[PDB]
Design a protein around this nucleic acid. Sequence first.
RNA 1: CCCCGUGCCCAUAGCGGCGUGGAACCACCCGUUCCCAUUCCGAACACGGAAGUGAAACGCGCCAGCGCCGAUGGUACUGGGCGGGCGACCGCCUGGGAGAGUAGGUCGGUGCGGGGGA
RNA 2: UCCUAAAAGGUAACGGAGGCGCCCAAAGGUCCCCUCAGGCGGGACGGAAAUCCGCCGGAGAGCGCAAGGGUAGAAGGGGGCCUGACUGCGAGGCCUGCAAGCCGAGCAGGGGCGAAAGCCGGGCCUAGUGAACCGGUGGUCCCGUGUGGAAGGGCCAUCGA
RNA 3: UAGAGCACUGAUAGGGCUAGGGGGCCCACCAGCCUACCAAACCCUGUCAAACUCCGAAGGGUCCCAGGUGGAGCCUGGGA
Lengths: 53, 181, 141, 110, 77, 69
Amino acid sequence: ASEVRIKLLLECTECKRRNYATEKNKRNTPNKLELRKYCPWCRKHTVHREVKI
Amino acid sequence: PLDLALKRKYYEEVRPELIRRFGYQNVWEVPRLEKVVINQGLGEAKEDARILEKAAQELALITGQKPAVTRAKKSISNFKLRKGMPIGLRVTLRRDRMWIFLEKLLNVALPRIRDFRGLNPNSFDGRGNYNLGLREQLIFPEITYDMVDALRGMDIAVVTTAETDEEARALLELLGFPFRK
Amino acid sequence: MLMPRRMKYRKQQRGRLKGATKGGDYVAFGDFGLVALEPAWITAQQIEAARVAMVRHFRRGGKIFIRIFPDKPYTKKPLEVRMGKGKGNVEGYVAVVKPGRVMFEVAGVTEEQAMEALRIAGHKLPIKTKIVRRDAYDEAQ
Amino acid sequence: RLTAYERRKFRVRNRIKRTGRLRLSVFRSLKHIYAQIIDDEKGVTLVSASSLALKLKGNKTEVARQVGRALAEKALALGIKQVAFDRGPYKYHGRVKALAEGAREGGLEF
Amino acid sequence: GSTKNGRDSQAKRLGVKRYEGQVVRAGNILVRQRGTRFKPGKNVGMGRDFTLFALVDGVVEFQDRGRLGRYVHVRPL
Amino acid sequence: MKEGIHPKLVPARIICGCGNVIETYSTKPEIYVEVCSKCHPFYTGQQRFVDTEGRVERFQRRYGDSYRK
RNA sequence: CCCCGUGCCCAUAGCGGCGUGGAACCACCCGUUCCCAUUCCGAACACGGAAGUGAAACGCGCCAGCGCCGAUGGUACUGGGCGGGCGACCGCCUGGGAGAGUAGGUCGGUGCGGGGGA
RNA sequence: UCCUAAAAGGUAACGGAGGCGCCCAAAGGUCCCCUCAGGCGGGACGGAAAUCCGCCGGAGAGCGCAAGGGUAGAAGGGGGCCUGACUGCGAGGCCUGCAAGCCGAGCAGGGGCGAAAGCCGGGCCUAGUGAACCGGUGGUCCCGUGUGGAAGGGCCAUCGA
RNA sequence: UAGAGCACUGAUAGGGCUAGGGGGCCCACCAGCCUACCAAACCCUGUCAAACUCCGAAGGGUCCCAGGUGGAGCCUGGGA
Ligand SMILES: NC(=[NH2+])NCCC[C@H](N)C(=O)O
Ligand SMILES: [Mg+2]
Ligand SMILES: [Mg+2]
Ligand SMILES: [Mg+2]
Ligand SMILES: [Mg+2]
Ligand SMILES: [Mg+2]
Ligand SMILES: [Mg+2]
Ligand SMILES: [Mg+2]
Ligand SMILES: [Mg+2]
Ligand SMILES: [Mg+2]
Ligand SMILES: [Mg+2]
Ligand SMILES: [Mg+2]
Ligand SMILES: [Mg+2]
Ligand SMILES: [Mg+2]
Ligand SMILES: [Mg+2]
Ligand SMILES: [Mg+2]
Ligand SMILES: [Mg+2]
Ligand SMILES: [Mg+2]
Ligand SMILES: [Mg+2]
Ligand SMILES: [Mg+2]
Ligand SMILES: [Mg+2]
Ligand SMILES: [Mg+2]
Ligand SMILES: [Mg+2]
Ligand SMILES: [Mg+2]
Ligand SMILES: [Mg+2]
Ligand SMILES: [Mg+2]
Ligand SMILES: [Mg+2]
Ligand SMILES: [Mg+2]
Ligand SMILES: [Mg+2]
Ligand SMILES: [Mg+2]
Ligand SMILES: [Mg+2]
Ligand SMILES: [Mg+2]
Ligand SMILES: [Mg+2]
Ligand SMILES: [Mg+2]
Ligand SMILES: [Mg+2]
Ligand SMILES: [Mg+2]
Ligand SMILES: [Mg+2]
Ligand SMILES: [Mg+2]
Ligand SMILES: [Mg+2]
Ligand SMILES: [Mg+2]
Ligand SMILES: [Mg+2]
Ligand SMILES: [Mg+2]
Ligand SMILES: [Mg+2]
Ligand SMILES: [Mg+2]
Ligand SMILES: [Mg+2]
Ligand SMILES: [Mg+2]
Ligand SMILES: [Mg+2]
Ligand SMILES: [Mg+2]
Ligand SMILES: [Mg+2]
Ligand SMILES: [Mg+2]
Ligand SMILES: [Mg+2]
Ligand SMILES: [Mg+2]
Ligand SMILES: [Mg+2]
Ligand SMILES: [Mg+2]
Ligand SMILES: [Mg+2]
Ligand SMILES: [Mg+2]
Ligand SMILES: [Mg+2]
Ligand SMILES: [Mg+2]
Ligand SMILES: [Mg+2]
Ligand SMILES: [Mg+2]
Ligand SMILES: [Mg+2]
Ligand SMILES: [Mg+2]
Ligand SMILES: [Mg+2]
Ligand SMILES: [Mg+2]
Ligand SMILES: [Mg+2]
Ligand SMILES: [Mg+2]
Ligand SMILES: [Mg+2]
Ligand SMILES: [Mg+2]
Ligand SMILES: [Mg+2]
Ligand SMILES: [Mg+2]
Ligand SMILES: [Mg+2]
Ligand SMILES: [Mg+2]
Ligand SMILES: [Mg+2]
Ligand SMILES: [Mg+2]
Ligand SMILES: [Mg+2]
Ligand SMILES: [Mg+2]
Ligand SMILES: [Mg+2]
Ligand SMILES: [Mg+2]
Ligand SMILES: [Mg+2]
Ligand SMILES: [Mg+2]
Ligand SMILES: [Mg+2]
Ligand SMILES: [Mg+2]
Ligand SMILES: [Mg+2]
Ligand SMILES: [Mg+2]
Ligand SMILES: [Mg+2]
Ligand SMILES: [Mg+2]
Ligand SMILES: [Mg+2]
Ligand SMILES: [Mg+2]
Ligand SMILES: [Mg+2]
Ligand SMILES: [Mg+2]
Ligand SMILES: [Mg+2]
Ligand SMILES: [Mg+2]
Ligand SMILES: [Mg+2]
Ligand SMILES: [Mg+2]
Ligand SMILES: [Mg+2]
Ligand SMILES: [Mg+2]
Ligand SMILES: [Mg+2]
Ligand SMILES: [Mg+2]
Ligand SMILES: [Mg+2]
Ligand SMILES: [Mg+2]
Ligand SMILES: [Mg+2]
Ligand SMILES: [Zn+2]
Ligand SMILES: [Zn+2]
C-alpha cells in the first residue's frame, strides 16, 4: 500500500453496509470499483461499490 | 473451386514436364505449391500515425484477403520499439486465392517493376522455397496512383513441397517465374 | 603474470590440502616433467620465477608447459589491525598443488638442458620436487 | 518433441485421471469412431463400443449417437453408472458430442 | 573498515515429514518443499505452497517414476 | 472465411496496353495496365526497346582508315 | 501373426540412415452446403464424403555413426578401533565401498480391449 | 535467498554474496486454444538485433521484481465468460520456549466457469512488515446508575506505526 | 557431504579450426594477397570451484517388528 495504491471498502448497494476491505490503484483504475460480493445481511449476492475507507 | 489459368497451367503443362524431367515414382512426390505468405515489414507506423489501415486496405485489395497484425516479441532501444507494438502485416494465401494472386503477380506486377531485369535466381531457401521483395505497392494493378499516400514495399515467401532448390526452380520457372540468370 | 581474467566470487575460503593429486599426475605434453612431492599453495610469483628461470637457462629453444594455474585468491588483512571487521583484501593468487602433480613439462631440448632447467626451476619452489621423464606408463593414460 | 495434438491429449487426460473416476475414452478416425471405458487403477478396459464392430451406416453423427447408446446399454449391464468423458484431443462438439449425448441417453452418469 | 555482509534469513525447516510406510491420518502434512520436488499421488493433495498432505487415513508410500518425477501416495488402511 | 472483413473477389478483366486481355479474379472487375508479361522487353525474347547497339565502342570508330602505312 | 485404441517400465525405448506395408485399419485425400473455425488463411479445428496415394505422417524390420546403458578387477573416500609428525599432514586394523575408465550391451519390453488373419 | 552447515532438522562470528518495507482490477477465478530461447538458410526500405518463411532445436527462454527451488504432459503466450481477492466454520498437521507464522480436506449459505468430470476461500513458491494501550469511521441495537430517553461504553467491520 | 566429474554456471594452459580487429604488401576504382599478432564461438589434449554437479558413498535421520528391567522411559504436580 502506498499513496497511489489505496485501501478501500466495498458497500452492498442494497443495505449500505460495508462488508469487504481491499485495495486498488487509483491511477490505474480511476473509477469506483463495482463487483458482485456475497452480502450476509442480505444473505445473497449483491453488487458492492467502492467506498472511501 | 474456381477455374483459373495458372492452376490449369500447372495441372496441365507443369506436372508432366516435371515428372519427365525428374522421374518421380508417385503422384504426390511431384512438387506442388503449398502456400504464399505476404508480409509488409512496416515498422514505420510504430508511433507517428500508427493508423496503418491504409496499408492493410491495400493488402486486402491486392490479395482479396484481410491481413493480420504482427507485434514485437521484445522491446528494442535503438529501433524505438516497445514490446507488443504493432509493427507489421502478414497475410497467408493458399489454394485458389494463392493461384489468383500468383497469376496477377506474374502477368502484371513483375512486368510493371521499375528497371525490372528478372527475379534473383539465388533467392532460394535451400529447402526448396523462394522469397523476394518489393519496393512499392503501385506495382500491383489493383493499386492506382491516386488512392496511395506513401510508398511501402513488402516481402513475398512462396513455400513449395519440393525438397531441393533444383526441383523448386523447375516448378517455379515452368509456372512462369522470370529469372534474371 | 598468471591470474584469472574474471571470477564469479572475489574471495574464497581456505579449504584443506589432504590427499594426493586429483589429476595431472602423468606427463602428457613434453619430454620431461617436474612433479610435486608435498602439498602447498604455490603463488603466481613462484610459478613466474620458475618459468623465467627455465627460459633463461634455455636462452633460446625448447618449449615449456605450465600445468598449474593460480585461481585461488589469497587474502590478507592490513598490517597492525585487530581481528574482525570483515575479511581481508586479496593480495595475490595461488595454485593448489598436491603431492604428485606435474607442474611443468619441457619438450624439444637436450636431456642435460631439461634436467638442469628443471632443477633451477624447482629451486624457486616452496616444496620438494622430483624430475621425471615420459614413460610408457604416461603414454598409457 | 511433442505435437499440439499430443500436448492437448495429455492436458485434458491428466485432468480427467485426477478425478479418480472411470474414463469413457473416445477415439475418432476419418471413417469410424471408437469408445472404451477404462479403469486406470488396473490398466484394464471394461466395456468397448465402436462403429467398426457394430457395422453402422453413413452419417458419422447419428452413427456416433448410436454407438453411444450401445456403449451405455452394455455398460449398465456390468453395474457401471458414473463415468468421466475422455474427449481426448477432440473438442466436445459434433461427432464426439453426439457420442456423449447418446451415452447419457442410455443412462450413463456424466 | 566495515562490512556490508552479515545478514541471512531464518531457516525454513523444509522437507519430508512422513517417510514411506508411516501410518498417517487425514490431513497430516507429508512433504514441505519449494516447487514440486515430490508430486502428489493417490489420496494426496497439494496446497498453495506445494505442500503435500494426506487426503485420507492410510500409509505413506513413495514411487520414483523416472522422468515423470517422484510421487507420494497414501494406501488406505 | 470470416464474413464481412474481406473484399469480395469477382471475375475480372485485366486489359494491357499491347492489346492483351487477362481473364482472372479481383476486387475491381476491370483494370487497365500499361504493361504485361506478354509485352515486357525482358519477356518477349530480347526485345531491347531502343538500345540494341553493340556498345558500340571502341574499335567501332573507323573514321577512318586513311593514316599512312 | 498384423493393425487400431489405452496403460505400465522411463532413453537397452532416442537421433540418423536404408528397406517395407494399404485387402483391413490408420493417415493423407475430395469438398466447405450444413455445425464449428482462423488476432488473415478449411494450415489448424470442424462437418459431409470415399476418386486416388502410401509421396508425408504412422506402423513394422535391418545398421552401432551419434546418443543412452554398463560389468569384473583395482583405486579414492569412509562409520568404528589404533598409531606417527612441531606442523601442512601421513600410516595400520576391521566393516562398507565409489566416480572416471575397460570389457561389453542397446535401433525396446510388456499389460488390457477391440478389428482382421490361421 | 544462497553459501559457510560436516548428504534428516537445526547450528555462530564485525564470516562470503545479494535483496525486501512494493506491485497486479488482471498480474485474480474458470473454460478453450497455443509453445520458447537460440543456430543456419531465404526475404523491399531493415541494420548484430523490428516483422516474414523454411529447417535444426527438452528447454539453455519465459514465469513483475534478489536468490534458490520448481516448471512446456505449464506455473509460460492468447481469448471467452466472470469476482471464490466469498460469508458461517473447520477434521488433521507443519513449526515452535511463549506469542506467533504456515498448509489445510470437508460440511452449509449464496455464487462463477464448464456439455461434464470438476475446479475456485486471490497471485509458481519462499520477503513486500508491527503485539497491546489510546482513539477515529461504518454497522449492530447488547448495557443505559430511581423510571422513559439521552450521554458514554460494549460487540462486528476497518482506520491512525 | 567425503571422493570424483566437466553435462550446467564460471575459470583455465597448449593445440587445431576459425567471425573479428592489429600489422605488412597492394589499393580508393572496391575489392584482393601474406600473418612466428591479440583473439569470440566450436573441437582436441590437460586442468580448477564454499556459494558448479551428468555422478555420489561411508554415515546420518525417521517409521515398523524384535532383543533390551535400566538411579531406563511416559503423565501430573512441589522445589531448585
Ligand atoms: N576406515 C576408515 N574410516 N578410515 C579412515 C582413515 C582416516 C585415518 N586418520 C587415515 O589417515 O588414514
Ligand atoms: Mg477481506
Ligand atoms: Mg493431386
Ligand atoms: Mg540459394
Ligand atoms: Mg520446402
Ligand atoms: Mg497499379
Ligand atoms: Mg579458514
Ligand atoms: Mg602463501
Ligand atoms: Mg588467507
Ligand atoms: Mg584474511
Ligand atoms: Mg590498533
Ligand atoms: Mg601473495
Ligand atoms: Mg624447492
Ligand atoms: Mg583422464
Ligand atoms: Mg555498510
Ligand atoms: Mg542493505
Ligand atoms: Mg538484518
Ligand atoms: Mg542464522
Ligand atoms: Mg536461522
Ligand atoms: Mg538459510
Ligand atoms: Mg526431507
Ligand atoms: Mg491450493
Ligand atoms: Mg499459489
Ligand atoms: Mg517400492
Ligand atoms: Mg499406492
Ligand atoms: Mg459462420
Ligand atoms: Mg497402439
Ligand atoms: Mg513403399
Ligand atoms: Mg486403401
Ligand atoms: Mg491399392
Ligand atoms: Mg470424395
Ligand atoms: Mg458457408
Ligand atoms: Mg445442407
Ligand atoms: Mg481441408
Ligand atoms: Mg484433421
Ligand atoms: Mg512412407
Ligand atoms: Mg497423427
Ligand atoms: Mg517408415
Ligand atoms: Mg546389435
Ligand atoms: Mg544412470
Ligand atoms: Mg562407468
Ligand atoms: Mg567395484
Ligand atoms: Mg577415524
Ligand atoms: Mg590413508
Ligand atoms: Mg579398509
Ligand atoms: Mg572389505
Ligand atoms: Mg563404476
Ligand atoms: Mg538404440
Ligand atoms: Mg530411427
Ligand atoms: Mg498393468
Ligand atoms: Mg485378438
Ligand atoms: Mg544449512
Ligand atoms: Mg546447506
Ligand atoms: Mg542441512
Ligand atoms: Mg523438525
Ligand atoms: Mg483478459
Ligand atoms: Mg503473476
Ligand atoms: Mg527463431
Ligand atoms: Mg538490406
Ligand atoms: Mg535482418
Ligand atoms: Mg529458466
Ligand atoms: Mg489466462
Ligand atoms: Mg483469463
Ligand atoms: Mg453470465
Ligand atoms: Mg488446530
Ligand atoms: Mg504454538
Ligand atoms: Mg503475516
Ligand atoms: Mg458450495
Ligand atoms: Mg454453490
Ligand atoms: Mg456450485
Ligand atoms: Mg451451466
Ligand atoms: Mg457443482
Ligand atoms: Mg477448499
Ligand atoms: Mg507476490
Ligand atoms: Mg496466473
Ligand atoms: Mg517488522
Ligand atoms: Mg502503555
Ligand atoms: Mg507501553
Ligand atoms: Mg475504543
Ligand atoms: Mg436497551
Ligand atoms: Mg430500555
Ligand atoms: Mg435511568
Ligand atoms: Mg416520553
Ligand atoms: Mg432515543
Ligand atoms: Mg448508543
Ligand atoms: Mg456505539
Ligand atoms: Mg498511534
Ligand atoms: Mg571435493
Ligand atoms: Mg565445466
Ligand atoms: Mg571430457
Ligand atoms: Mg557447496
Ligand atoms: Mg552412474
Ligand atoms: Mg543410506
Ligand atoms: Mg548432519
Ligand atoms: Mg542408521
Ligand atoms: Mg537416535
Ligand atoms: Mg521390543
Ligand atoms: Mg522402575
Ligand atoms: Mg535421569
Ligand atoms: Mg518437575
Ligand atoms: Mg523439595
Ligand atoms: Zn446487503
Ligand atoms: Zn502487354
